[PDB]
Amino acid sequence: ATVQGGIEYRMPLPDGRVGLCSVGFPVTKGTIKGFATAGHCAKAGQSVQISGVNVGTFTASHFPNTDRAWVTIGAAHTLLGSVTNYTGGSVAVKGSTEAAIGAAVCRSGRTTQYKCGTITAKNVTVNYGTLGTVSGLTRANNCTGRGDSGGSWITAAGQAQGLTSGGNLPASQRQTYFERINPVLSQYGLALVTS
Ligand code: NA
Ligand code: NA
């Protein structure tokens, strides 16, 4: 199977239920293949399917306080250093220069597909009720829906920005949040796949 930023992955849960989330960025750890995503999506040990096929398992997850995780992908699968735009194209990943407030950014995920907007605030804390809070999030006004969680945020020029932080699917003025990608890469020791 092919792992690309923004696409759906599925998580087999107990009693035949299935969780849905979106790929953030394909990464390598040494020669290990993987992808970064949201920690709200799963805990370590959660199996992961893409395109109907077992592709890997969550390796680490840190939520709340942060909202980050990464999945180890089996060696037989192909990593694409790009983010799908859901309409036949992709944005090639070039690096992770963090963009400023006001910068144009697009996010990709399986519920609302590819939606674009601008960054409006940084270092925001979001309240998750009984779970506690997540701090340090960047806010933007892009459209988003439940299930986009974990998916890619990238500038058109290809600089990776972050991972959608938001609600799970049950199994400026819009306010949408993402987890910054550079702290995630650093914590887990991950290198972005580029193209
Ligand atoms: Na917190
Ligand atoms: Na590459």
TrEMBL record:
The active site is at residues 40, 67, 149. It comes from the Bacteria. Disulfide bonds join 21-41, 106-116. Belongs to the peptidase S1 family. This is Lytic endopeptidase preproenzyme. It comes from Lysobacter sp. (strain XL1). The gene is alpB.
